[PDB]
Structures are given as structure tokens and as C-alpha cells.
């Protein structure tokens, strides 16, 4: 006495949808991250402009993987050089490589970091 239809439209009733519970993983193991931080940072630039950035703007110039973004470049430089960076500016060179201008934090100096990196 209560099954009522106040609408002249029939809609498909909502039926529950089960979450996948596979009996075997399709791939046996997850593939390791190929874009690790050693892959992100390839080599630093040592041109005259790169040297000018180090002792003017406290900035390290790097050649990075083209698929790495600013967040990934920021983390990569932080762990394998133990420095803190302020911001990362990124461009893709006409030759196809990606170049990152990594400005260090004020408490870090880009000159001694470049000295211990080995790109003086």
C-alpha cells in the first residue's frame, strides 16, 4: 500500500558495485621508479652564464631529465646535496634537454656547494 511512483520517469535502480578482489596480481611485482633522484639530476651546467648565476643569484644550474617537474627537482637536489632550496625555475633547451635554475636558501651559499660538488 506504499509502493508509489510520484514521477512518470522510470530510472535504472541503483545496484551495488563490488570492488575488484583479484585472485592474482596481473604483474608479479611493481616496477621500480626509473625516475629516481640520480636520474632526475644528470649533470650541472658550467658555462659562463651558469657561473654567473652561482656567484650572483646564489643559484645552481643543472641539466635534468625532461620528465622531471619542479617538485621532483626540488626533492632530488635536497637529498643528494643536503641543501635547502628556495625556488626552482625550469626551461627546455633548444637541443631538447631540460635546464633547472635552482636558487638555494639564503642560509646556504651556492659557491661552496658548487665547490664541494666539483663544478668550480
Amino acid at each position: 500500500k506504499k509502493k508509489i511512483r510520484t514521477s512518470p520517469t522510470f530510472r535504472r535502480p541503483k545496484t551495488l558495485r563490488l570492488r575488484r578482489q583479484p585472485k592474482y596480481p596481473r604483474k608479479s611485482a611493481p616496477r621500480r621508479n626509473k625516475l629516481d633522484h640520480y636520474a632526475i639530476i644528470k649533470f650541472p651546467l658550467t658555462t659562463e652564464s651558469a657561473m654567473k648565476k652561482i656567484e650572483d643569484n646564489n643559484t645552481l644550474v643543472f641539466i635534468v631529465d625532461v620528465k622531471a617537474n619542479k617538485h621532483q627537482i626540488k626533492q632530488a637536489v635536497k637529498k643528494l646535496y643536503d641543501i635547502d632550496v628556495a625556488k626552482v625555475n625550469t626551461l627546455i633547451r633548444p637541443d631538447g634537454e631540460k635546464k633547472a635554475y635552482v636558487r638555494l636558501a639564503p642560509d646556504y651559499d651556492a659557491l661552496d656547494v658548487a665547490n664541494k660538488i666539483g663544478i668550480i
Binding site: 508509489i4 511512483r5 510520484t6 514521477s7 512518470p8 520517469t9 522510470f10
Partner: protein, 241 residues
């Protein structure tokens, strides 16, 4: 006496152009899915169209009383399922080993199911009572059975529900079931069923052959026709006498 004076009725009238209509039932006016429309229009078509008696005979099914006593008798002769057949076989194997061996033990009467199994029993005169479902959806598997049962002389009845016959044989659907020989304490009950079945189906098979179905118009068509029949009869009556 203590009723708060602020309470009062606020009736809303649902006349045309006034307060919006209430959420009333619209089931009759629903845009239904095509599968619902198809099966409802199929039912109406069977009512409109001339239904040949060979197809219309299945509309005449057993009454609720007689169906109950028939299924009640048929429940005493259900085919055994997979579980107790194993128990029967395991008991037979151990009894065979120690030490009777064969021990036929008078294989009990059982209900025979399936249209192919039953039709061979009817042709062989070995069926005592045939029960046919009324809603065999591909209605060619059983259109011949009522005539075949009549000629062979075996009493036959039509029951509502192939699912009920299916539940009788532990399956989803059974088209027909047949009564082979029956136990002595059930012979009287089977006899009470046969003569009533035989009066309603075998004895009046001649006018079952000629009883067409359908050919009934829709209520709107009937009502307006009846309105016209009443429309002039209200002055023909004044005309006469």
C-alpha cells in the same frame, strides 16, 4: 480546552491554476522500459487476438483446491536429490559388501518428469495421470499432449506454474510430470484425483477442441460501444409500447 490557539488548519485546494498538485500516484502514466512494455503488450495481444483452442486449452487450469491435493500427493513421490542418492548408494555398497549383494528391495515408485519422458509413457499407456504446466513459454512442447493423452486414454490435467512442477523435481522448471504406478495407501487418493481430472479434461475434449480464446476488446473500446448501445436503446424502449 487546552489546545494552543496558534494551531489552525491550512487547507490547500488543488484546482486548476491554484496550489501546485500533490505528489500522487502516476504508475499508470509512466514511461516504462521497453522490456516492461513488450511483456505487457504481449499479454494484451493474447487477449485481443483469436487464440486457437490448441493454445487456449492451457488457460483452463486446475482450481486451487485440486491443485493443492495433486501437489500434496505428488510430494510423496518426489525424485530423490543428489544427496540421498549418494546415501542410498553408500548404504547399498556397504550392504552389498556384507553381505546381501543384489537386494533389489522393490525400487519405489517415483514421479516421472520431462516432456520427452512423459510422452513416451503416454504412448506406451504406462502413465496413470499427466500434469502439464500452463505457461510453457515456447508453447509447442505441450500443445500436442492434451490430444495425445485423450487418444491414449490417460487422464491429464493442466496446472498453474511450471515453477511449481520444477520445485517438485528439485529444478527450476519442469514442463510436465506423470504418475506411473502408485503405492497402495495412495491409490485411493490418486483415484479421487483421476475421476475429477477426467471429468474436466478428457470427457469434454470435444468442446475443448472448439473453444477459441481471446477476441475481447479493451475496456475503453467496450465502454464506448456499450455507451452507444445504451445511447439508442434509451429511445427504442420509448419507441416500443
Amino acid at each position: 480546552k487546552v489546545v494552543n490557539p496558534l494551531f489552525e488548519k491550512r487547507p490547500k485546494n488543488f484546482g486548476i491554476g491554484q496550489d501546485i498538485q500533490p505528489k500522487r500516484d502516476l504508475t499508470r502514466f509512466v514511461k516504462w522500459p521497453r522490456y516492461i512494455r513488450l511483456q505487457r503488450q504481449r499479454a494484451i495481444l493474447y487477449k485481443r487476438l483469436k487464440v486457437p483452442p490448441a493454445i487456449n486449452q492451457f488457460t483452463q487450469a486446475l482450481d486451487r483446491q485440486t491443485a493443492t491435493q495433486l501437489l500434496k500427493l505428488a510430494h510423496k513421490y518426489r525424485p530423490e536429490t543428489k544427496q540421498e542418492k549418494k546415501q542410498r548408494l553408500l548404504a547399498r555398497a556397504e550392504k552389498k559388501a556384507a553381505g546381501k549383494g543384489d537386494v533389489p528391495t522393490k525400487r519405489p515408485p517415483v514421479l516421472r518428469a520431462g516432456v520427452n519422458t512423459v510422452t513416451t509413457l503416454v504412448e506406451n499407456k504406462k502413465a496413470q495421470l499427466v500434469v502439464i504446466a500452463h505457461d510453457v513459454d515456447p508453447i509447442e512442447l505441450v500443445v500436442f499432449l492434451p490430444a495425445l493423452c485423450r487418444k491414449m486414454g490417460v487422464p491429464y490435467c493442466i496446472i498453474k506454474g511450471k515453477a511449481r512442477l520444477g520445485r517438485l523435481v528439485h529444478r527450476k522448471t519442469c514442463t510436465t510430470v506423470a504418475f506411473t504406478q502408485v503405492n497402495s495407501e495412495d491409490k485411493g487418493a490418486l483415484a479421487k484425483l483421476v475421476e475429477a481430472i477426467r471429468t474436466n479434461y478428457n470427457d469434454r475434449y470435444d468442446e475443448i477442441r472448439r473453444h477459441w480464446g481471446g477476441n475481447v476488446l479493451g475496456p475503453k473500446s467496450v465502454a464506448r460501444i456499450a455507451k452507444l448501445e445504451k445511447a439508442k436503446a434509451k429511445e427504442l424502449a420509448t419507441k416500443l409500447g
